[PDB]
Ligand binder design. Structure first.
Ligand SMILES: [Mg+2]
Ligand SMILES: [Mg+2]
Ligand SMILES: [Mg+2]
Ligand SMILES: [Mg+2]
Ligand SMILES: [Mg+2]
Ligand SMILES: [Mg+2]
Ligand SMILES: [Mg+2]
Ligand SMILES: [Mg+2]
Ligand SMILES: [Mg+2]
Ligand SMILES: [Mg+2]
Ligand SMILES: [Mg+2]
Ligand SMILES: [Mg+2]
Ligand SMILES: [Mg+2]
Ligand SMILES: [Mg+2]
Ligand SMILES: [Mg+2]
Ligand SMILES: [Mg+2]
Ligand SMILES: [Mg+2]
Ligand SMILES: [Mg+2]
Lengths: 46, 109, 176, 111, 236, 376, 322, 158
RNA sequence: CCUCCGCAUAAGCCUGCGUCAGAUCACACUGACAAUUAACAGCCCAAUAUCUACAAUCAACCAACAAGUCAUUAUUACCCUCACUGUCAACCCAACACAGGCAUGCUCAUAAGGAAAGGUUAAAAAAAGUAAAAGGAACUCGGCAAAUCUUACCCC
RNA sequence: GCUACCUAAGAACAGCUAAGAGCACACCCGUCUAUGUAGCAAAAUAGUGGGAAGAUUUAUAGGUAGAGGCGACAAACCUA
RNA sequence: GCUAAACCUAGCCCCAAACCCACUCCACCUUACUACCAGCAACCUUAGCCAAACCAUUUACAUAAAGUAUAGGCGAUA
């Protein structure tokens, strides 16, 4: 069927999936954040 | 799906909305069956003086003369409470048994 | 009453109101603690009134009668804050010998950059605070490289600034 | 008082005082026809309903009968030459009912 | 990978405990067992398998009265609610075990043998040779692990020295200490073997996902193997 | 078998750092800072006690050090205690003979149904917006309505104005048997309270004649079996009222059982047993109040009644308490068990069978009325 | 979605608003054994009945007061069955809900896709009277159907939302204590107690001492109106087929000590702007100021007991249906 | 951690290999500390100890970069401290014995202020330093008072 | 004339056809000013032991099988009350003012909500319907499609 | 946040005939035809249809991740 | 004659030198930007493309000695 809308929003999920806390939780996440900072991004995490 | 907009209490689902708040400062605690318990001591009581017979005003007449600035450092203060010391020839060691603690502040503003 | 939230009924609709000068700091310093406190409340009400007036103006599509006065008031307030704060600081110095009242310390976070961690104020000791122990204050080796990169970036920026300045100077010289 | 660390009240401890209050307030004209005795203020976000009540009582000596606050959203839509969103600030509105049937019509300025 | 096991209830109880399903998953989160999950919901009646255990401050053999004989969702053998003294407990029921019926729970290895009633529990020393048993411990005071399914029964083959020899249902022999406790008779709900399932719906309800469609060519193992029954296993 | 599983228990604290074994140097730990660092050793903190007391984060002492902890365990009964043996055990606990019919006098005191029917309908259909009301709503309601109806014969009997049904009344009563200490506790049910005591049903010959018949043993179930075994109890008996309270004499314990699930409800035998216990307990308390706590056979034996539970079924009980000396003569109870007004109610019409109570019988109602009357 | 009207309201000068909503006219005034019993009732809950678990000040109105009230109702009823035979047959209902739903006035939709359309604005009351007395025969009339009484209804100069009164959409319910299939469809006396929020101490602490009486009055206006309305509905009548005979009911609101007494006279269900232009009829509410049943309780002795209140209560109970 | 050629010929696969040492658990007495430690020791360690004779001796003798263990370093430090202080290790009734023990290790035994820092990591050392030079700040008031006093004295002199 | 939609709540979005001023299929587009007020809903619950066998299905008879969704008690601890946040809209996800997707409660023809036709002409071709003389599968790979409805037999 | 499978705690299934029963709404799927093919749409519309008290459908939160997972194997599905 | 064209200075690149930055107040590891209550913790050879004309051992990561000794499917190359 139509497959365009993969996204189907719910804030809680987003926060758990992609939030600051989650990022902090691993080394990889931390590294990601660091990279973002280096780049100079306005929103490091969600 | 904005990352840029500031996250706030308006933004989430129900639970999220309930949780956050603005910088309100809580006035008590919450118990039993969601009965809030307003403690009187947590609420800030505004100590307003009486302004009757008070000759000061919110602006200062232009005729008042100019004078150079003097940052009120500790030394100056000491000097202006050193007469008694001089006479001798008023200090707390700790302030843990004191209401208004100067260092790790108790007093507000 | 609520009459204090507006100025004298004489002054409504003049477009020019006389109100001379802010409180300079010296004057404030000269005044007593109690006196200062008293003055603060006088100031506050005035400020509120000014704000109200501004709001009214905004509503009505009209300009403020005299917006300098508000500014002056604000300045005065600031001065007052400074004076009292200064005094407090002095007192602290005399007693405990502490610059800043609220305690903190130099803490290296996850990202490696050293931060002034201001202390938060609690009921139980740090060792059995469940939340606080999650908030980790240390780097690990994966951060060093990133730090280095950051430093390099900073240096580049600095270089750009300096060279630019030099170029500007050269241009100026050429001109004159 | 806004933007200050509040001391921690344990249980037997003293009353919290605010000497020299930080937040300052502005009473406004209502937009949508309120009852007589209602007064509409703009509280700065951090200040509470109780605080407002106290504030009015102390500094202005008004008999406040009830207070009802509400957080108004300030619009985020509206952009620059850059296409970056200018945010109008969100503020707190206070509906303060006076006591003793005191009554208060908001006066005409700019006649 | 959040996985705290539901098995977390230190106090013994009769109240049926709430039970999280697995899906054939590990604590990692990956499928370690195929064909599991999506059954009907169940609650666990904690079965006391150590048959002989006296209540607090009591010593010797005691009696018990059966109150109810319920169906357990967790297993093929149906269960019995028992009471004795001041405490109740769930035990695995025997064949022909009725409500209001009495059960003995002995520690006593007698001089002579003990004529057993289908339900009651004794050491293997006390039993006659050739008596059918179930809920057999592997050591003294260990707890019953063997012969627990519906209709199952191992015969007591012989006694030599301070040890008894058991024939397990699979038929492989097992030597145990003479003092280890067992219950006599065969385990409740015979005819579980012959229960026709009728449809795949039933299977689903029970909690078994279907077999995969992947066609596997049969290998070496797949022929019938005729072997001698492996050596009698001892716990001594 | 140990129940618990290792992965769900509080994890063992990690192995103590190797510097602590060395006598005697100062181990450099992160307690100098105020946070964990992997390098630097794990510090050992002193067990912190909060000085001042905050109720909302309070921790009680261990059961050992309590102001009234006794070694001999008291076995205590409440509304939620729910006996394995039902009535025979209750009797044993109470020390009493069961009699299968209600007494004659009460029956006589009988010698209209539309009203009853109406009440039933109200309970089971009319009293709330939602169709088919729940038993947590209707069971008490029905009882209340019945009580009201009964009262509505004050015009006939003017002595019925000397009573009052009261809601949050507890009691406590403690006694011995073999000897193990026993206690009963208050209800979540109504108490019909009168000014005058009830008259004695059995004569002093009848009472005497109890001596011959024995209490039923029921081994091996222990009699206490389903009661709360309790150390830390306090032995004081208590009628639920201070001295000088008018309407002090307990007439009938209108105790009920709400609860919409079959399991939460009592099962009838258990309920009956509970009722009996309550009757004993209140009666016992009354006796204690009257005479000394010194045990004996009574001169004027007190009588308490109790009506059962449930919108559908009814268990009627009268209790003749005649001996404070337990461990001789015994007490005697008269039950009319599981009598039941109305077998089934239909809230919606089936498709044939109309909207109302099928299988109605007024005998139960009559019995109830009689019970209510007794004193007048 | 309809305005969710709460009888026991915290809102200030809510009475006038309530009147406007309902179209009532408020008027001040009205159109030994027992005493002993009352005293006993008072004592039982405050002194004699031994509480196992301790009672706190948040827990006081629920645990102490409501049961006392119930006792008063029931015992008094029992007493008065000789003096008044209708209370014998009457059905007495404890905490049994009273719902009433009506429409008063138009509202053009201010914004959205429904903007600029006449929405007739709706209300609902959902009360739970501590207890009430229902009868199968209707009570007397008090005042004639169509009575002028020229004192006039409050105006109200703005939207009803500005008095903190909020909207919601749920089940529209016209419900007297029990369903239509029930002979006891009429009522008479209604007993309310106010919760912790509307204790007079609290009011005193705030600056709303004026509103100590007001709250009670508001409650009377609401709950009574709902009950009468419900009754009217049960006998066929509604906004178009407006009541032929005046429906009447009675109330006695309280907070522990302080009682007052409120008769109600229902002359109209025609509240829709369709049926109000040709309408001189209007509902009526009679009422006393809240008077203390006692001064205080010193141990097990009521200090300054008030018999007038008791008498009033008796009168309320003891009025007949002719 | 290394790699092997398959059959020790280079024209076969190269494939990665971890050679692990054979770990054991053993008790160990030490005269300097008077305690029995249970350690994850290997046979080479044992051999080394034997060569050096005492475990204590080995600990002392063996250099920090050859010890290759933090625990070992710590132990060494402790021993050094003991040597320095001359602490009551064996308590009353064994003073002579203690003396004898000390004399057994007359070699080694550095001044006490060096032995405190032996066998520390860098971070640990830093922490120690911080602890040492911690101190609550001196009230300025006191300083001012002192100054005043000095001034007064000066005045008196002149 | 349509109504196969509507009003709510949930989730989502986040001021997105309110007032005034202003400009440039036809005039929801820019600037200023205004608004959503808690009772609904979120935001909970001092310890230590100790208790919780009997489903739900109008719960009553029957009747089962897959065996189930709503409870304490004892003792110690405890007077302080109603703060904080959500509350707008023509709305979300599909790049769009997209015939698609989108949980639940009422409403089941509506008391809500809407407009198939910018104007004209009336050609072919194309699309969607309705029509039918006589015949009635002669169509075609096949009765596909349509129309009226139902007989028997294989394979798998 | 799609889909594949699972875990927790939820919700839905009118009406007529008499059980992974039949007809038939809501809901789910997607047989055949036509239209559409830079489309209303990166898989839709119109009809016609298979299912619709169950191995049913479905909202919420959590879990398994690529040398992997998940799979009533179609080498499916794992954000066009 | 419309669309358009045109335009220098924003700044930037490579060096040289010199070792950088980081707390007005408030908030920020819980769903970061959240005033206020009883639990764990970092270190573990790069690989492969590619070249060898495939590919399998193998294939680089001041000056001069010296592309010398060496190494190497003794070849690519190192
Ligand atoms: Mg198979
Ligand atoms: Mg197969
Ligand atoms: Mg809305
Ligand atoms: Mg698209
Ligand atoms: Mg319409
Ligand atoms: Mg059109
Ligand atoms: Mg056209
Ligand atoms: Mg034709
Ligand atoms: Mg042809
Ligand atoms: Mg043909
Ligand atoms: Mg066809
Ligand atoms: Mg079917
Ligand atoms: Mg079908
Ligand atoms: Mg295949
Ligand atoms: Mg294939
Ligand atoms: Mg190649
Ligand atoms: Mg090539
Ligand atoms: Mg090739």
């Amino acid at each position: 069927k139509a497959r365009g809308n993969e996204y189907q929003p719910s804030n809680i999920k987003r926060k758990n999936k992609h939030g600051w806390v989650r990022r902090l939780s691993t080394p990889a996440g931390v590294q990601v954040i660091l990279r973002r900072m280096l780049k100079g991004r306005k929103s490091l995490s969600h | 799906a904005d990352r840029m907009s500031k996250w706030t209490s308006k933004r989430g689902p129900r639970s999220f909305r309930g949780r956050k708040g603005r910088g309100a400062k809580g006035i008590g605690f919450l118990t039993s069956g969601w009965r809030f318990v307003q403690i009187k001591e947590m609420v800030p009581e505004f100590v307003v003086p009486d302004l009757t017979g008070f000759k000061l005003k919110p602006y200062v007449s232009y005729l008042a003369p100019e004078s150079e600035e003097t940052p009120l450092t500790a030394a100056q203060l000491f000097s202006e409470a050193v007469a008694p010391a001089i006479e001798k020839d008023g200090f707390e060691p700790t302030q843990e048994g004191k209401l208004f603690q100067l260092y790790p502040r108790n007093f507000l503003r | 009453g609520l009459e204090e939230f507006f100025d004298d009924p004489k002054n409504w609709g003049q477009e020019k109101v006389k109100s001379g000068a802010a409180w300079t700091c010296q004057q404030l310093r000269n005044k007593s603690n109690e006196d200062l406190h008293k003055l603060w409340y006088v100031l506050l009400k005035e400020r509120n009134m000014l704000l109200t007036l501004e709001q009214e103006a905004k509503r009505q599509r009209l300009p403020m009668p005299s917006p300098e006065r508000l500014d002056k008031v604000v300045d005065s307030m600031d001065a007052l804050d400074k004076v009292v704060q200064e005094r407090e600081d002095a007192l602290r110095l005399l007693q405990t010998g502490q610059e800043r009242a609220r305690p903190g310390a130099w803490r290296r976070d996850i990202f490696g950059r050293i931060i002034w961690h201001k202390f938060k104020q609690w009921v139980i000791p740090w060792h059995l605070n469940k939340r606080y122990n999650r908030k980790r204050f240390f780097a690990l080796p994966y951060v060093d490289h990133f730090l280095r990169l950051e430093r390099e970036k900073r240096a580049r920026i600095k270089a750009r600034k300096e060279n630019l300045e030099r170029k500007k100077a050269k241009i100026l010289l050429k001109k004159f | 008082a806004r933007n200050v660390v509040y001391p921690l009240y344990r249980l037997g401890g003293p009353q919290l005082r605010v000497f020299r209050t930080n937040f300052f307030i502005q009473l406004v004209r209502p937009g949508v026809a309120q009852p007589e005795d209602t007064v509409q203020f703009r509280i700065p976000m951090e200040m509470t309903r109780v605080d407002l009540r106290n504030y009015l009582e102390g500094i202005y000596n008004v008999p406040v009968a009830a207070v009802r606050t509400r957080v108004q959203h300030g619009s985020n839509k509206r952009r620059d030459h850059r296409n970056v969103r200018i945010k109008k600030p969100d503020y707190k509105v206070a509906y303060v009912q006076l006591a003793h049937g005191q009554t208060f019509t908001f006066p005409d300025l700019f006649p | 990978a959040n996985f705290v096991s539901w098995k977390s209830r230190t106090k013994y109880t009769i109240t049926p405990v709430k039970m999280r399903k697995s899906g054939g998953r590990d604590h990692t989160g990956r499928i370690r067992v195929h064909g599991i999950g999506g059954g009907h919901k169940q609650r666990y009646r904690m079965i006391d398998f150590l048959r002989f255990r006296p209540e607090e401050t009591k010593s010797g053999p005691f009696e018990e009265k059966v109150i109810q004989v319920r169906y357990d969702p967790c297993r093929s053998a149906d269960i019995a609610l028992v009471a004795g003294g001041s405490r109740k407990r769930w035990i695995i029921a025997t064949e022909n075990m009725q409500a209001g019926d009495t059960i003995l729970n002995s520690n006593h290895i007698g001089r002579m043998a003990v004529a057993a009633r289908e339900g009651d529990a004794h050491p293997l020393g006390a039993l006659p040779v050739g008596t059918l048993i179930n809920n057999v411990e592997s050591e003294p005071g260990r707890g019953a692990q063997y012969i627990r399914a519906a209709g199952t029964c191992g015969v007591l083959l012989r006694k030599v020295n301070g040890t008894a020899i058991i024939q397990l249902p699979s038929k492989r022999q097992m030597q145990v200490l003479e003092t280890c406790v067992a219950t006599v008779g065969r385990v409740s709900n015979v005819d579980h073997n012959k229960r026709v399932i009728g449809k795949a719906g039933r299977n689903r309800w029970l909690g078994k996902r279907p077999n995969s469609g992947r066609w596997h060519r049969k290998g070496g193992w797949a022929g019938r193997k005729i072997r001698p029954l492996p050596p009698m296993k001892s716990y001594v | 078998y140990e129940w618990g599983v290792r992965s769900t228990r509080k994890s063992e604290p990690p192995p103590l750092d190797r510097v602590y074994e060395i006598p005697g140097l100062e181990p450099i730990t992160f307690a100098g800072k105020m946070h964990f660092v992997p390098w630097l050793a794990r510090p050992i903190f002193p067990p912190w006690d909060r000085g001042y007391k905050d109720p909302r984060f309070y921790r009680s002492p261990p059961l050992h050090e309590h102001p009234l902890y006794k070694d001999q365990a008291c076995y205590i009964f409440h509304h939620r205690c729910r006996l394995l043996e039902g009535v025979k055990q209750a009797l044993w606990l109470t020390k009493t003979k069961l009699i299968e019919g209600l007494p004659e006098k009460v029956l006589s005191l009988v010698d209209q149904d539309e009203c009853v029917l109406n009440v039933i309908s109200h309970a089971r259909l009319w009293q709330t917006t939602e169709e088919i009301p729940k038993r947590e709503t209707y069971c008490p309601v029905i009882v209340d309505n019945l009580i009201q109806l009964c009262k509505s014969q004050i015009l006939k009997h003017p002595s019925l104005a000397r009573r009052i049904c009261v809601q949050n009344s507890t009691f406590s009563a403690t006694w011995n048997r073999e000897s193990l200490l026993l206690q009963v506790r208050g209800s979540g049910g109504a108490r019909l309270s009168t000014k005058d005591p009830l008259p004695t049903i059995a004569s002093r010959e009848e009472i005497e004649a109890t001596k011959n018949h024995v209490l039923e043993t029921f081994y091996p179930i222990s009699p206490i079996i389903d009661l709360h075994e309790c150390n830390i109890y306090d032995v004081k008996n208590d009628t639920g009222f201070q001295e000088g309270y008018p309407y002090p004499y307990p007439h009938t314990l209108y105790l009920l059982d709400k609860a919409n699930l079959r399991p939460h409800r009592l099962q009838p035998d258990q309920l009956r047993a509970k009722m009996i216990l309550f009757a004993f307990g209140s009666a016992l308390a009354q006796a204690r109040l009257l005479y000394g706590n010194d045990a004996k056979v009574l001169e004027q034996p007190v009588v308490v009644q109790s009506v059962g539970t449930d919108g559908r079924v009814f268990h009627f009980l009268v209790f003749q308490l005649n001996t404070t000396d337990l461990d001789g003569v015994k007490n005697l109870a008269w039950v009319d068990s599981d009598q039941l007004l109305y077998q089934h109610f239909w809230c919606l019409p089936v498709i044939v069978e109309p909207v109302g109570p099928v299988g109605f019988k007024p005998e139960t109602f009559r019995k109830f009325l009689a019970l209510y009357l007794h004193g007048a | 979605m309809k305005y969710m009207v709460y009888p026991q309201t915290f809102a200030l000068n809510a009475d006038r608003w309530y009147q406007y909503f309902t179209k009532t006219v408020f008027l001040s005034g009205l159109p030994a054994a027992l005493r002993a019993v009352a005293c006993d009732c008072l004592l039982q809950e405050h002194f004699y009945l031994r509480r196992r678990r301790r009672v706190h000040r948040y827990e006081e109105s629920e645990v102490i007061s409501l049961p006392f009230l119930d006792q008063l109702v029931s015992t008094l009823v029992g007493l008065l069955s000789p003096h008044n035979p209708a209370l014998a047959a009457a059905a007495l209902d404890y905490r049994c809900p009273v719902h009433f739903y009506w429409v008063r006035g138009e509202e053009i939709i201010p914004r959205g896709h429904r903007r600029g359309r006449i929405d007739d604005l709706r209300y609902q009351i959902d009360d739970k009277p501590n207890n009430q007395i229902r009868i199968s025969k209707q009570l007397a009339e008090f005042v004639p159907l169509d009575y002028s009484v020229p004192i006039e209804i409050p105006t109200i100069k703005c939207k009803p939302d500005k008095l903190p009164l909020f909207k919601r959409q749920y089940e529209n319910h016209i419900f007297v204590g029990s369903k239509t299939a029930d002979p006891c469809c009429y009522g008479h006396t209604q007993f309310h107690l106010l919760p912790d929020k509307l204790r007079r101490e609290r009011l005193l602490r705030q600056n709303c001492a004026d509103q100590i009486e007001v709250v009670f009055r508001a409650n009377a206006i609401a709950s009574l109106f709902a009950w009468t309305g419900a009754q009217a509905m049960y006998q066929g009548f509604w906004s178009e087929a407006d009541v032929t005979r005046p429906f009447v009911s009675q109330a006695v609101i309280t907070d522990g000590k302080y009682f007052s007494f409120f008769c109600y006279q229902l002359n109209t269900l025609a509240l829709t702007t369709q049926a109000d232009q040709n309408n001189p009829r209007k509902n009526i509410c009679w009422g006393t100021q809240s008077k203390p049943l006692y001064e205080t309780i010193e141990d097990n002795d009521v200090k300054g007991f008030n018999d007038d209140v008791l008498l009033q209560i008796v009168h309320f109970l003891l009025n007949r249906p002719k | 951690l290394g790699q092997i050629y398959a059959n020790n010929d280079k024209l076969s696969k190269r494939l990665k290999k971890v050679w692990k040492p054979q770990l054991f658990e053993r008790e160990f007495y030490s005269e300097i500390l008077d305690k029995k430690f249970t350690v994850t020791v290997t046979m080479r360690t044992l051999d080394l100890i034997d060569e050096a004779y005492g475990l204590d001796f080995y600990i002392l003798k063996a250099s920090g970069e050859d010890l290759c263990s933090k625990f070992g370093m710590d132990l060494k430090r402790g021993m050094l401290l003991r040597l320095a202080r001359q602490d009551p290790q064996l308590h009353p009734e064994d003073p002579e014995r203690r003396a004898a023990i000390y004399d057994k290790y007359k070699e080694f035994a550095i001044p006490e202020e060096e032995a405190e820092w032996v066998g520390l990591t860098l971070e640990e050392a830093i922490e120690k330093q911080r602890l040492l030079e911690e101190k609550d700040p001196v009230p300025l008031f006191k300083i001012y008072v002192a100054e005043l006093i000095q001034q007064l004295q000066q005045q008196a002199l002149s």
